[model samples]
Target: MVTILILTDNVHAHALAVDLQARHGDMDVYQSPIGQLPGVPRCDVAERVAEIVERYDLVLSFHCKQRFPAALIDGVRCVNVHPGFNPYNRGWFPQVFSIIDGQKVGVTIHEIDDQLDHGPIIAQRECAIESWDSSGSVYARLMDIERELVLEHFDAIRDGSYTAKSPATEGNLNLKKDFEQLRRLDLNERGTFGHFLNRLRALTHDDFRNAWFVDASGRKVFVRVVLEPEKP
Candidate 1:
């Protein structure tokens, strides 16, 4: 008789919901996509979060857009699924950010806190980046890990056995770069040929973004990818 509310969107969120339904057909799982709440009841007041705690036994958010509400944490159980290893890579597009910074990538399922992705860690799985992998490719792999991570926590959800930890004291406060940043890639001026190849790989992927800047001369300049005809 465990009722849960889900707030999220995209394929990642949808996949998680599907798995949960398959595991517990009678479980009440609510969904409200970004910019649209669908049929689920919407809350506008900051204090309305407290109402949710009173109504539901558990709140599970999947790739939720808003930060955790304080009222939602009033002795109630809540959890979140984040994509990245956290503390260091806890910002927007971690798959792209980690690959760009030459670090390991993974997904995290943690207890939600007031700060975004700064909550207590419940579980994590490391996903390695291949030389040829792009942001989109990395995410495609992580989707598989996301399902595994959720199943790993099924025991905790069922038994209500969650461990709490202190929030992140300090770390890089990185947010998603604006659209302008997405359109440009800095190739280090003297970047190695391999560097251009990696940049191209990143741009080709759907999730990573592929765009070029337009100069006043009305010319569109695309960044060089590794496999761009090899100067033929």
Candidate 2:
């Protein structure tokens, strides 16, 4: 009997769990209560969460922000679905990093360990980055890709037939602090059109938190710009 635990707070995780349950009736799929919280800064909640995690067999953490300790995950088979390609765009806002670095934007499911976003690769799929793509569009596209990849590899993972591979080496890691810095643009800095364009695309998203910059009066302002097509 395969016992699986899902740690997530979004629709993606719920959908995946439902599909898995429908396919495998014998499987026991349990979800974390209210998903894993931001278990950082040292707290009692994180400790209780870790204790619960150790009781599961196979754990799938999707769209979850909790960071599990090494002791809790090492004894079990845990996989995390990250919304970016491994060894390239990792950590927070991978789509932003992808556009900034001009690297391939994609999704990667990897074995979870102590390190942040540094783990063995279980599955990966690449997505196209169009010239006019914003982080929101790219994120939506990758979500679909990640869903497909997870379902496609479900049987293999459940049957214990799949093999996880180690990443070549630790790649770029984008922390929350770095992402916060990216939010503010330097209007005074001189750069070519292409440079600014890349920054705009990287920071632009459909959500409320769009790219922002400091104004002359030292006030923070958020704005979005659309690129016009060149007249033929």
Candidate 3:
């Protein structure tokens, strides 16, 4: 029997678990009870290796912000569904970089290793960003892609029939600091309109000044963008 444990952080993970259950009713799937109750904190997944290994045969990382520790990954067959294509866009705000760097943006399901998103790729699929796409819009699409990838590959992953490969080149990584620098808009910077707008679109999350510039008084000012489609 293939018993599975899912490490979930936010609501998206919860939805993923629910969908997985619906898709694969034959398997046993358990997810973290985070955000289910008032002030019910997320469990420390790394610290509960004994509890995990004793019950489950495999572990899946779904929208989980925390990294799996060496003890947990080494102890169990762990897999992660990352929002960005591996070896290029990794770590914080992968969707943002996919727009900024023009990299192929998508989801990568891979085996868990010690490094940050540096693991053998089990499955991946690319997504597109339209000219008028924003971070929030692209983010929502990525969530859909993740759902597709995980469900399509679940049987192969669970049965050990899938192929996993190493990245061809050294991949890219981004930190919160890197994203912060990206949000700091340069008021005096010069660039083509397309380049500038791409930067803005990459940072233009809903209701957040993800991209901002400082005014003459040295105060931060927020910026937001709105785009409407052409009428038929």
Candidate 4:
């Protein structure tokens, strides 16, 4: 088993950590300090990255907030597990744009490069988007697929067996600007309710007022989707 360093944070980090440990008993996996779940010892990735880069054979970044130094990425093997399908919805909240823009929503295991989510693709699994999927719901599905992809491909990534290919088209890159703009709605906006609701649903997440509109009194009114099945 080769030395591997996993950089991650937030919810899905736990799943990856435990799954990796179970799958690869001999795997020398050290995760960067994460917000939740524990298996491997927590190492501060930001502080000890130099030593880490020099030491570890491979670095797998799963939703890690830390940006890499150019030399570190250029010097060694660093692969990223991205939530959105490549060449589309490259940055920030991918599931949000995936719903609104009708782009491919899936998990991508790609090589990390200078650009955000723009490296050569190692492997990709395109997930189906349901009509009723909100940003949060789709996000959950994407995370699940991401877990499966990593488990299937971790060994190949560590062993340097899989080929990383370039994305065919230059897809859209979304930032906070796009999402934030969409969040704030105009009262008399010239659009059909269906069109308006599409944007609303795209922004809606679990328990969060991600979509909103300002009232005549200048008060911000938040909106959310409440879906319940009717009794048969």
lDDT values, one for every candidate: 0.67, 0.73, 0.79, 0.77
Candidate 2 vs candidate 3, lDDT winner: 3
lDDT of 3 at 72: 83
- Residue-level lDDT tens digits of model 1 in 105-148: 78888787788777788878899987777777888888889888
> Candidate 3 lDDT, tens digit per residue, 119-218?
8999998889888898889988988888888878888987878889988986798888899999988989999998888898899987886888889998
TM-score of each: 0.80, 0.83, 0.88, 0.87
User: Model 1, poorest ten-residue lDDT window?
Assistant: 223-232
Over 4 Å off in model 1, which ranges? 31-47, 164-169, 178-182, 186-188, 207-209, 221-232
Q: Top TM-score: which candidate number?
A: 3
Candidate 4 regions with alpha-carbon error over 4 angstroms: 25-47, 228-232
Q: List model 4 lDDT by residue over 22-90, tens digit each.
A: 776644445665555555567775577588777878877776445677877866798888888998888
**lDDT-based ranking, best first?**
3, 4, 2, 1
Clashing pairs in 1: 197-226
Q: Give one clash count per candidate, in the order shown.
A: 1, 0, 0, 1
Model 2: residues with Cα > 4 Å off, grouped in runs = 25-45, 48-55, 227-232
